[PDB]
Design a protein. Structure first.
Lengths: 293, 292, 61
C-alpha cells in the first residue's frame, strides 16, 4: 500500500517485534504501520512531526514503552510516545541543541537505558539520556563530540552490555572511516580507531549483532560495500580487519542492513538490486541471492 | 490411542453434546483462526470453520448449535446444522481484553476475565454487568452464584442473582503463589471443589467444612494444565502438567499415579471426556480417541 | 576513577559559587560542569565563545 507520503520517503524502520513499521518523509509526517494478523500492512497513524523534512527515525526498546524518535532538517529531534487510548502519538520532548540540520538519530542498546545519539551538519555527535525512566520528558544531554562536515550516519554497537563495552561508528563523507568508543570512568567518548579504505560518500553504516561471536562486524554502504571486523585485545585495545569489498552493484550502495541475529547482511543500490549476504566458514562474505525491482 | 496430526496447534476439544465420538475442535494461533466440527473420527471436515477471531469461550450451544467467545473478548456462536452442512452465526458481540475461562449456568453463559458481561439465552442485549475489575476461576456453585479467582489464584464467591458488585465470600491459600490457571469444582456435589497447584500440587477445597486448604500435592512438574475426569464416574480422574504431560492419578481407585498418556509431546488443547482431552496450559496439537 | 571523583565530589569549598575549579583541585575536568549563559543569550559572540573553549582545551583559570 502506497506509503501515503506526498514527498520522498527518507527512512523506514521496524519495531522490536518487526510487526510495526515507522516511515518518515520530506512531507514532514511520520506514518506508523500495523501489520494486521490478517496479512496486510495498514497505517496506524500519520502526523505532522516537524516544520522541515524528516530524515531519520528510530524505535526505542519495548521495555521503556512505545517510543519513536525523529530527526529533521528543522534542527530538532523529537521523541514521541504512543497513546493506546487515541493524535495517536504525543511529543515527549524536543531537542533544540543542534544548531544545524540533523542527518541521523539512533537509540542506544536497551541495557544502557534510554539513550540516543544524533549527528548533524554542525558535525557534533550528541548523546541524550533519560536519567529517570519514569520521566520520558526528562532528556539530559550526556555528551558532545566533534567530527567533520558533510554526510553523516550513526550506528551503535547492539552488543548486550555486561559482555561488552559501548562504542559507536560514525560515517561522514568519505574513503574515510571514523570510529569511537567509551572510556572507563572519564565517561567520555574516545577515538579508538578509524575504518580505512572508505570509498565515495558513506551513504550508510550499520553495526551487526555480535550474537555468539567474540568479534564485531560493521558494514558500510559507500558506493562500494565493505565489511570490517573489529577485535579488542589486551594502552590501546583495538584492531580492525577488512573482511570483504563488493562492487557488484556497480554504483551507489544506499542502504546496508543486518539480520536480527547478524547472520545475513543486505545491501541495496542504484542497480535497483538488493543483495543478501552470508558469511562463509572462512569468514568471507558470499552473496546468497539478489532481489530486483 | 489413535493419534492424528491435524497439523494445527489445537486449542479446544469437545466430546460434543449429541459417547466421546463427535469430536469438535477449535484451533487458535493460525492466520485465519480455526475450528472444525464433525472432524474427524473419517476425514469429516463438515464444519472446518473459516473464521476470523480466535477461541476464548467455546460451548456446544446445542447438539446442533455452537457457542464461543472471540479473541478480543468478542463473542461468536453459530448453530451447527449438521444436516445441510451450513449454519447461521447466532451471537456476535464486540467488547464483552479477552476472557480467561468459560463457565456455564444454563443457559446464561457466564464467564470471567483476566469485568463480567452476562449475555444469556437469547439475551442479545448485555443484561447483567457487575463490572468489577479482576486482578480465571469461573463456575456455577449454585445458580447463579459464582466465584471469581484472580491471578493471585484468588477465589471470591460473588453472584449475578441478587444485586451487588462485591463478592460474597473468598477462598484463598496462605501464600498466593501460583496464578489463576486451573481450579476444580466437583460434579459429585456443587458445593465440593478443589484446584490444581501450578507446582504440581492439588488444592482441594471445602465449602461447608471450613475453608481450609484441604489437599495440596507435589506430583506434577509444570503449571496446572487440566484434568480428564469421567463424566459419570466423578471420582475417576487423572492428572496432568503444562508441557502437555499427564500423570494418571487413579482417583476412582490409593495414590496410583503413573506416566499416563502418549506422553512427551507438546501441549494439549481443552477438556471434554465422556465414555477426549485434558488441555494443557499451552495448547498445542495432540489427539487420541480411545477413551473407554 | 569514579570512586576518586566521588571522594573529590563530596567536599565543597563554599556556597554559593560555580566552583568547577573546586573539581580542578580534584584535578578532574567535567564537560557537564563546563556546560555558557552568555552563549545561550547569544543563541560573532558564538565564535568568540568557541575560541574561548578552544583556548581552555589547549589555563584552567
Amino acid at each position: 500500500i502506497a506509503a501515503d507520503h506526498k514527498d520522498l520517503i527518507h527512512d523506514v524502520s521496524f519495531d522490536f517485534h518487526g510487526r510495526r513499521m515507522a516511515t518518515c518523509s520530506s512531507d514532514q509526517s511520520v506514518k506508523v504501520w500495523d501489520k494486521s494478523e490478517n496479512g496486510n500492512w495498514h497505517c496506524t497513524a500519520s502526523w505532522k512531526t516537524h516544520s522541515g523534512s524528516v530524515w531519520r527515525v528510530t524505535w526505542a526498546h519495548p521495555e521503556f514503552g512505545q517510543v519513536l524518535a525523529s530527526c529533521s532538517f528543522d534542527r530538532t529531534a523529537a521523541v514521541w510516545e504512543e497513546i493506546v487510548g487515541e493524535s495517536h502519538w504525543v511529543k515527549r520532548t524536543t531537542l533544540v541543541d543542534s544548531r544545524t540540520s540533523v542527518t541521523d538519530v539512533k537509540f542506544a542498546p536497551k541495557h544502557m537505558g534510554l539513550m540516543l545519539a544524533t549527528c548533524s551538519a554542525d558535525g557534533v555527535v550528541r548523546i541524550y539520556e533519560a536519567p529517570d525512566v519514569m520521566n520520558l520528558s526528562q532528556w539530559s544531554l550526556q555528551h558532545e563530540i566533534s567530527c567533520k562536515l558533510s554526510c553523516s550516519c550513526i550506528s551503535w554497537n547492539p552488543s548486550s552490555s555486561r559482555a561488552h563495552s559501548p562504542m559507536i561508528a560514525v560515517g561522514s563523507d568519505d574513503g574515510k572511516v571514523q570510529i569511537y568508543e567509551y572510556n572507563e570512568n572519564t565517561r567520555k567518548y574516545a577515538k579508538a580507531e578509524t575504518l580505512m579504505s572508505v570509498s565515495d560518500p558513506v551513504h550508510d553504516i550499520a553495526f551487526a549483532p555480535n550474537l555468539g561471536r567474540s568479534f564485531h562486524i560493521l558494514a558500510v554502504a559507500t558506493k562500494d560495500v565493505r565489511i570490517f571486523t573489529m577485535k579488542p585485545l589486551r594502552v590501546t585495545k583495538f584492531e580492525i580487519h577488512t573482511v570483504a569489498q563488493f562492487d557488484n552493484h556497480n554504483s551507489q550502495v544506499w542502504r546496508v542492513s543486518w539480520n536480527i541475529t547478524g547472520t545475513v547482511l543486505a545491501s541495496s543500490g542504484d542497480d535497483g538490486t538488493v543483495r543478501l549476504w552470508k558469511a562463509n566458514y572462512m569468514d568471507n562474505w558470499k552473496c546468497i541471492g539478489v532481489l530486483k525491482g | 490411542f489413535a493419534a492424528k496430526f491435524v497439523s494445527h496447534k489445537i486449542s479446544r476439544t469437545r466430546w460434543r453434546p449429541v459417547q466421546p465420538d463427535v469430536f469438535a475442535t477449535g484451533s487458535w494461533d493460525n492466520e485465519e483462526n480455526k475450528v472444525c466440527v464433525w472432524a474427524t473420527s473419517d476425514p469429516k471436515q463438515l464444519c472446518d470453520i473459516k473464521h476470523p477471531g480466535d477461541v476464548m469461550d467455546m460451548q456446544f450451544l446445542d447438539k446442533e448449535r455452537i457457542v464461543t467467545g472471540s479473541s478480543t473478548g468478542t463473542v461468536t456462536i453459530f448453530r451447527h446444522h449438521e444436516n445441510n452442512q451450513t449454519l447461521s452465526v447466532n451471537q456476535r458481540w464486540e467488547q464483552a481484553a479477552p476472557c480467561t475461562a468459560i463457565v456455564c449456568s444454563s443457559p446464561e453463559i457466564v464467564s470471567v476475565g483476566e469485568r463480567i458481561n452476562c449475555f444469556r439465552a437469547e439475551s442479545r442485549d448485555v443484561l447483567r454487568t457487575i463490572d468489577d475489575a479482576d486482578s480465571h476461576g469461573v463456575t456455577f456453585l449454585r445458580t447463579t452464584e459464582i466465584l471469581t479467582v484472580n491471578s493471585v489464584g484468588q477465589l471470591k464467591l460473588w453472584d449475578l442473582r441478587k444485586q451487588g458488585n462485591d463478592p460474597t465470600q473468598i477462598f484463598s491459600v496462605t501464600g498466593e503463589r501460583v496464578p489463576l490457571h486451573c481450579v476444580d469444582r466437583h460434579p459429585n456435589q456443587q458445593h465440593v471443589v478443589a484446584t490444581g497447584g501450578q507446582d504440581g500440587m492439588l488444592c482441594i477445597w471445602d465449602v461447608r467444612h471450613g475453608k481450609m486448604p484441604m489437599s495440596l500435592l507435589n506430583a506434577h512438574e509444570a503449571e496446572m494444565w487440566e484434568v480428564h475426569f469421567h463424566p459419570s464416574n466423578p471420582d475417576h480422574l487423572f492428572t496432568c502438567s503444562e508441557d502437555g504431560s499427564l500423570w494418571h492419578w487413579d482417583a476412582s481407585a490409593q495414590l496410583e499415579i503413573t506416566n499416563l498418556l502418549p506422553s512427551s509431546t507438546l501441549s494439549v488443547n481443552s477438556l471434554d471426556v465422556l465414555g477426549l482431552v485434558c488441555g494443557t496450559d499451552a495448547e498445542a496439537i495432540y489427539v487420541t480417541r480411545r477413551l473407554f | 576513577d569514579v570512586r576518586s571523583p566521588r571522594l573529590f565530589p563530596s567536599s565543597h569549598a563554599k556556597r554559593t559559587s560555580s566552583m568547577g575549579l573546586l573539581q580542578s583541585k580534584f584535578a578532574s575536568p567535567s564537560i557537564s560542569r563546563i556546560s555558557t549563559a552568555q552563549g545561550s543569550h547569544s543563541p560573532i559572540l558564538p565564535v568568540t565563545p568557541w575560541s574561548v573553549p578552544a583556548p581552555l582545551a589547549p589555563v584552567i583559570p
